Amino acid sequence: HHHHHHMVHITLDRNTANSWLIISKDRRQVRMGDTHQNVSDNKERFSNYPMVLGAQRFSSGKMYWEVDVTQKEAWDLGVCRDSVQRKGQFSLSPENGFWTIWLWQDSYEAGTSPQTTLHIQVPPCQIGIFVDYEAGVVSFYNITDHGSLIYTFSECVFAGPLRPFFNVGFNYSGGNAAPLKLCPL
Ligand SMILES: O=C(NCCc1ccc(O)cc1)c1ccccn1
């Protein structure tokens, strides 16, 4: 792809984080802690899952960023509406305001309803995410495999400002402690 020139500098919004997440000083990395991280609760925090939003809001234009997923067993990545549900149980779907892909139990899937199987020959260590607001497109790229396309959501109905979306996943196995990292431009 040739989307790299739309690169944006994403930072994580501490106030939206699940209370077990640990965000680095530079707000560019996040991992699952082994306990509650001693923060107050608020209506913005994701309660049920290890999720956090980017601070940046997008309502127009073309945006691109990259995320490092090295040595993770489970994660979700993409964008979501600013007004997505934060509390209780929900599925990641465009009907609920999410445009995402994930790794789970050694398979990759797009967060459609129902979910769509992805075909990845080279397990990615870094994911590129492209958003074209006006066109209604969210695309995912395999940076480890020379930028090959993973998935395109088209005919998106964003219906609000968008925020970068992250889920570091649970670590029940002891094999999923590694962080998500926003990669440098
Ligand atoms: O699991 C990982 N590191 C643990 C992070 C940590 C744990 C405890 C602590 O006190 C401070 C830092 C990892 C990091 C990079 C790639 C893969 N795995």
Side-chain angles (χ1 to χ4, degrees), residues 1-184:
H1 68 83
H2 302 291
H3 297 310
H4 304 90
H5 57 112
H6 300 297
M7 183 71 81
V8 291
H9 185 80
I10 301 306
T11 61
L12 297 173
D13 181 349
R14 300 183 165 285
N15 283 341
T16 69
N18 176 280
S19 62
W20 288 46
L21 294 182
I22 301 170
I23 292 169
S24 62
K25 182 154 59 190
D26 66 3
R27 298 189 306 107
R28 300 275 283 171
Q29 311 192 15
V30 57
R31 67 184 180 86
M32 189 53 165
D34 286 331
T35 193
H36 185 292
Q37 293 305 130
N38 205 27
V39 294
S40 59
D41 209 354
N42 71 48
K43 67 205 195 159
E44 302 179 65
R45 295 201 185 288
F46 288 100
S47 64
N48 287 47
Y49 313 104
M51 292 166 181
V52 61
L53 303 185
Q56 289 73 36
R57 285 43 145 22
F58 304 124
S59 284
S60 68
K62 294 174 178 184
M63 287 71 55
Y64 179 76
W65 63 98
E66 295 179 354
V67 187
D68 196 299
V69 298
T70 300
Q71 204 76 89
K72 292 191 70 53
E73 295 175 347
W75 50 261
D76 317 323
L77 288 174
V79 293
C80 65
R81 299 189 184 135
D82 61 351
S83 59
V84 291
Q85 178 183 346
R86 308 304 169 84
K87 309 302 184 182
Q89 295 166 97
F90 54 88
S91 57
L92 297 176
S93 64
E95 305 99 276
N96 287 342
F98 300 90
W99 299 266
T100 63
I101 68 170
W102 64 74
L103 172 60
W104 172 246
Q105 299 190 166
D106 216 12
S107 77
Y108 300 89
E109 301 179 318
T112 55
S113 183
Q115 70 268 21
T116 301
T117 296
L118 302 174
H119 300 97
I120 299 184
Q121 178 59 29
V122 177
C125 297
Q126 301 89 34
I127 302 290
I129 301 175
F130 176 69
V131 179
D132 182 337
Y133 198 101
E134 277 63 41
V137 167
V138 184
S139 295
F140 297 82
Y141 299 91
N142 185 341
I143 305 315
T144 305
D145 183 42
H146 315 277
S148 55
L149 181 67
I150 295 169
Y151 193 79
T152 294
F153 292 89
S154 67
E155 315 190 282
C156 298
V157 178
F158 297 133
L162 290 174
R163 297 185 67 178
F165 174 79
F166 309 85
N167 187 354
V168 298
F170 292 103
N171 187 27
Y172 294 108
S173 64
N176 198 37
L180 294 173
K181 308 186 189 172
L182 284 153
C183 307

